[PDB]
């Protein structure tokens, strides 16, 4: 009874440290999840029944995703290696179901967040300043590690409390996150996290309402627009780095980063228009480029990429209407389950559930924004981490919302 609670508490404490710092932390954490579910045998038959208002839109939405994503193979005879990455999105079901049975103490989750962020900062500092490395990621890919760091920092931004020390810890969370990201380059993730943290000031300070966020974003936008009045500072001449690219893309020459990205997006969204329901197939995006009439007349870099770099374009082109709906659902259904728990916690007082729901919503927003520039489905580490975190936060969120 109690032992499951204590071990689940220490596991949620150590999850960020295991994932970020420990090299093979994904396997260790997936073993920690298993050594909990294997302990409650007659449980979880009366735990699905208790939280079927939250569990079911985390099980049906993933089962439909898997079914639609494997129902492409019956005709599009691509090998099974494609569906080995979506085999890792089923882990969200398990990591939510285990938490639902074994009630944790999410007071330690935030302490784990800050400990993991500080230790990851130390590791990255060592790997950049001494063992000279261009892309100092701990033990995974640089982009996947950047996504991990952004998600951890945004979760930790929702510290429950209103006090000097709690605000200090919340601010240090984003400070460490931005230091880690800047040491790893990939400033796109930095700007995504910065724009995602602005709506989270709703959860951060429980005094600044919707108007005290609207005014803030208006001021920030005006400050940003103030740059072009004097186009000398680096602020003007980095968003002016793509003006030439787009104006050239509108002309004949398309051999630039923005130009290549837009050309791939158009060659994806025209094929999707030609094949509304089903596309080339699951994965297999290279067939569009290899069979188009643009790559037949030129050998630009856009004709050799394995997959597109836009989730809303890659999913639509490869799968089609059902695939686009299920891919959208995989992110939006959690976004609808977090709101329904946040409002319940708000109606119950219970600030911890409110902050947890805010953290979950921020994670969903950050995942969508990151997917607006890259395909998060390709990286196995990104997929497994997102599934684990989205199934772990909503577990305690539902636990706090109900009782």
């Amino acid at each position: 009874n109690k032992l499951l609670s204590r071990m689940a508490t220490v596991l949620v404490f150590a999850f960020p440290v295991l994932i970020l710092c420990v090299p093979r932390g994904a396997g260790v954490f997936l073993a920690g999840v298993g050594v909990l579910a294997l302990l409650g045998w007659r449980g979880m038959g009366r735990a699905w029944r208790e939280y079927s208002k939250v569990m079911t839109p985390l099980a049906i939405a993933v089962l439909a995703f898997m079914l639609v994503y494997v129902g492409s193979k019956l005709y599009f005879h691509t090998p099974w290696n494609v569906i080995d990455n979506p085999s890792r999105t089923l882990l969200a079901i398990l990591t939510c179901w285990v938490i639902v049975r074994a009630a944790p103490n999410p007071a330690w989750l935030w302490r784990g967040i800050t400990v993991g962020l500080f230790l990851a900062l130390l590791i990255v500092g060592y790997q950049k300043f001494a063992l000279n490395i261009d892309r100092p990621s701990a033990w995974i890919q640089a982009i996947a590690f950047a996504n991990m760091i952004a998600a951890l920092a945004l979760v930790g931004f929702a510290r429950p409390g209103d006090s000097r020390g709690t605000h200090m810890e919340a601010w240090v969370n984003l400070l460490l996150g931005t230091m880690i990201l800047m040491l790893n380059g990939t400033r796109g993730a930095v700007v995504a996290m910065l724009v995602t943290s602005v709506p989270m000031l709703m959860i951060r300070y429980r005094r600044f309402s919707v108007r005290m966020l609207i005014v803030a974003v208006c001021a920030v936008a005006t400050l940003a627009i103030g740059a072009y009045m004097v186009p000398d500072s680096p602020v003007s001449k980095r968003v002016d780095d793509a003006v030439s690219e787009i104006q050239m893309y509108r002309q004949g020459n398309i051999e630039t980063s923005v130009g290549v990205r837009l050309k791939i997006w158009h060659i994806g969204l025209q094929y999707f228009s030609e094949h509304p329901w089903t596309g080339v197939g699951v994965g297999q995006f290279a067939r569009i480029l290899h069979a188009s009439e643009f790559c037949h007349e030129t050998k630009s870099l856009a004709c050799v990429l394995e997959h597109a770099h836009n989730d809303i374009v890659e999913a639509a082109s490869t799968t089609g209407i059902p695939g686009l709906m299920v891919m959208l659902g995989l992110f939006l259904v959690p976004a609808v389950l977090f709101a329904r728990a946040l409002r319940a916690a708000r109606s119950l007082g219970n600030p911890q559930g409110v902050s947890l729901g805010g953290a979950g919503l921020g994670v969903v927003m950050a995942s969508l924004i990151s997917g607006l520039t890259q395909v998060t489905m390709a990286h196995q580490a990104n997929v497994v981490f997102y599934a684990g975190l989205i199934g772990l936060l909503l577990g305690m969120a539902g636990r706090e919302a109900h009782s």
Partner: antibody
Amino acid sequence: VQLVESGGGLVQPGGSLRLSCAASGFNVYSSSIHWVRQAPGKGLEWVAYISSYYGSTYYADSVKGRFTISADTSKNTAYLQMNSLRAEDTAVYYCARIMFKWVSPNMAFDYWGQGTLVT
Amino acid sequence: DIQMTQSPSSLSASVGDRVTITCRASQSVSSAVAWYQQKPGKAPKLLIYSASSLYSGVPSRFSGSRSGTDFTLTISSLQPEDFATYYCQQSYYSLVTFGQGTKV
């Protein structure tokens, strides 16, 4: 998209030389420009580069302390300034540009220059 | 720093016989090794980036793969224009390094 370099020639040891790597079709402040040299009848040897936006630079073991790489976004050109050359610095010097950061998170040289010979 | 070794340093094979080239590494570079082809008195051009992805204008004969820290390149078949020197560059460490350079 073309990269051209010039400035090489005959120089006695102990002197100095500057190479200008003019670029076209892109912005030097956007991507990163790498200098690389190849000894005659030998393999390629890296020397230095500059970062995309930050301007941070790294140098090879042999050329550190005397080679000065620089960029000028006003003229969209890159320069490598060498001081106190010895006889072991005779090689053909090439320009190099990495691919886009998104297509390759790790640096990979795609567009090069014609190269110049220094002796 | 990091030392890259290539084997064989120089090998010859007739047309139609596939040839493999191995690039080793002193330390662990995850996937930041690319391959270049240099013709005599000409600027080298990129062939494979991230050790497993082809570059534009490169025929599908060229292919690379990763096995731990021992990186290998192979060609489907040899055509008369494929006889040129090859190099491997590691980009994981901020101080990049080129290999010794094999010759076909």
